[PDB]
């Protein structure tokens, strides 16, 4: 007996189903580490991260909500992106879009 214990049924959960995704190779050219959150507009991340920003437009990381991906200096890796939904209107970040798309 363990107070308040869970009895989680085995298996897995499929995240962000039915949505457009794309893979992008990203390389950190900066001298300091960079960490990106699940819902950040990928196309507007720290400028030291080199990748096809045009392909990442309107996309965010296809990772469980709340988690992040870290890039140590010089690190290169391929990440999977999933498209924003809702009104698909981007406001904030580096102020590059500030409107729909």
Residues 25-44 that bind another protein (CB under 8 A): 30-41, 44
What lies within 8 Å, CB to CB, of 22 at 6+ separation is 55, 56, 59, 80, 81
Query: With CB under 8 A, what is the number of residues at the site for another protein?
Result: 58
User: By CB under 8 A, is residue 12 in contact with another protein?
Assistant: yes
First vs last Cα of the chain: how many Å apart?
A: 53
Closest separation between CB of residue 49 and another protein, Å? 10
The single-letter DSSP state of residue 8 is P
Q: Which residues bind another protein (CB under 8 A)?
A: 1-17, 30-41, 44-48, 60, 62-66, 68, 70, 73, 80, 82, 84-95, 98
């Amino acid at each position: 007996m363990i107070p308040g214990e869970y009895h989680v049924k085995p298996g897995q959960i499929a995240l962000n189903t039915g949505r457009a995704t794309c893979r992008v190779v990203v390389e950190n050219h900066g001298d300091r580490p960079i960490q990106v959150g699940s819902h950040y507009h990928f196309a507007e991340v720290n400028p030291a991260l080199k990748f096809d920003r045009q392909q990442a437009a309107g996309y965010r990381l296809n990772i469980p909500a709340g988690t992040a991906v870290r890039f140590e200096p010089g690190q290169k890796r391929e990440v999977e992106l999933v498209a924003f939904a809702g009104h698909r209107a981007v406001f904030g970040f580096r102020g590059e879009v500030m409107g729909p798309l």
